[PDB]
Amino acid sequence: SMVRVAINGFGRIGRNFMRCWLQRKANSKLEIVGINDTSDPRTNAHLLKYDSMLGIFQDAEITADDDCIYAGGHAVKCVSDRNPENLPWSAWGIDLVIEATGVFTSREGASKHLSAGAKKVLITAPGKGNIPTYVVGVNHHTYDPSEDIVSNASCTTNCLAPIVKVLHEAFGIQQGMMTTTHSYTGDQRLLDASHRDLRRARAAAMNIVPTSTGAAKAVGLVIPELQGKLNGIALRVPTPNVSVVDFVAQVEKPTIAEQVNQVIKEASETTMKGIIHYSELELVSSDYRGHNASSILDASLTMVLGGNLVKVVAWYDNEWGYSQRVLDLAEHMAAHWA
Amino acid sequence: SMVRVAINGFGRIGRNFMRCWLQRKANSKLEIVGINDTSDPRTNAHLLKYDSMLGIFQDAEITADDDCIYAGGHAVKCVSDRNPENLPWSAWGIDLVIEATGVFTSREGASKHLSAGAKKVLITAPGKGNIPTYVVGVNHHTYDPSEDIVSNASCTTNCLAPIVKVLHEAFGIQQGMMTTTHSYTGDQRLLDASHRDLRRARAAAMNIVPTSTGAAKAVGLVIPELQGKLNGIALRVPTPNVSVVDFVAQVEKPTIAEQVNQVIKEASETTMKGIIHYSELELVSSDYRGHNASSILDASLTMVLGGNLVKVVAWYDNEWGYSQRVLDLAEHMAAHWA
């Protein structure tokens, strides 16, 4: 039978995920049956259809009433309560919650969905504490069907970890540094304004904005051999979607740029097909809108110094590519539902 | 002695107002003694000093501790309570509150400051309900010293009303339409997200966003003869500050562009000096950052058809010019205090 899904938080990720599922609904073991969000169904149906980044949804009709959003006759019940403990998960027979609010990323927070009756929670963000973390294509086959709360990591970790895994297996990563030049996200202020982070306080579309990030350290959760060996930062810049990881690694086996590219190309054609795409084209960020890969290696930018210092650069659609991976992880959990 | 001022809401207008006052402090009847805001004083001192639009504050040192912001040795007490009824206005001896949160624009809301101990409130926005409204240079001399809650109208009203007054007195305005091509503001969303206004929901730096404006009808509040005779709209565009009003008037006395310009130029040199600036220069929005006028007529753009259809175009720095007018109104109240 279908795994019944509720989305908690109908934001950029919640709505990208919904559109990902609507396009893949024919081959899915998931049925999205509910949404909880701070807004109402009519507003949310409007935003689902009219998206500044994805364009107008035209695969099916999207309508709403007081209680539901309808996506091609398919009814999605809607509620609006900021406290997950109050949500109708038992009443709606919810199996899996996609936790996309950005707020309930700890075990105690995400477990509020379990208290409300859901059987499992998939957090669309790094977990806080000891939450099992997965990157599809890197370690998702280690998923244990008895786990009740899981994390799909961050968009940046999903871009970096597949590349790191391929490079580590070919050359042996000893240490690595990352910078993501990243589109702005909804955690940043539009104009300079109150924020707990003084950098995120600043006008997002007018500035290059550094932030700390756990995304590189988190690769060590999904490639345990590299725990403690990676670190990095983010630079948020004035584009609204699509980001790029710059990764500089100290490797054991001496190499040259041509070999680095061939190793990633080979993986993209075989063990990482659908996860890493390999490109020799001279493209720019707009060209990667809607790309389904977690990582697109920009092969023209690869460089090596002294055999052991390797630079690679990889694009990712931080909204859509990540949401495809959320759906992939959820479909994997559904296929292995005990 | 000095009228003791508290700022409620230390946002774009609250902080622009603070900088306006710091630069005009030598000849002021106002002493800014307190700030209430969502943030703490260290965050707010940082934002007061480091401004993406105004640049780094140069005229005096800005620091903070747990309790105060310090601007050039002047200590400003800080509190953080989102319910104004709880604010320490009695203990701090606050005479005048600058209400710049955007959320206490009705009499019932603004009166919470009076319950807390303040004597008067100046709302930095159109009032909701029966609130006396002033535009400096248009009707501020009508200020009734017995009023306890006043409104300084909107930025667009402050740009449009002086021009309308001059055109009406010279030619007789029968009807008029306005469109402000306006910088985005913090009420809009950085990326598509829920909002009571389905257009303000949409990514602000990516879109031209039509929205309602009461500014045309509010001109009828400050020029009572024109009540019901004006209407218009706003188009929010991807600039972070500085806006432009396009006003098309149906006038009684037939005229031509040269005469319209002569009339506004004469007013800008006499009755409207410091309120309207007249420019024949071929400038763009960035050049009007920090301009102190309420309205800068772009004289090259004036056109008239058939004697009676008049188009004028006027720039305004919606953050800084408006905050200069808030300060002017507060000084006027302080000089007519009862």
Binding site: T38, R82, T101, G102, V103, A125, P126, S154, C155, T156, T180, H182, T185, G186, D187, R189, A193, S194, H195, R196, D197, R200, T211, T213, G214, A215, A234, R236, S243, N318 | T38, S39, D40, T43, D66, V79, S80, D81, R82
Partner: peptide
């Protein structure tokens, strides 16, 4: 702990409080 920090504990989804790891 400041009032602002308590505010972000009570309203973690508020615009002043969002931290997306990116």
């Amino acid at each position: 702990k400041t009032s602002f920090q308590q505010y972000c504990d009570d309203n973690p989804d508020a615009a002043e409080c969002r931290i997306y790891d990116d």
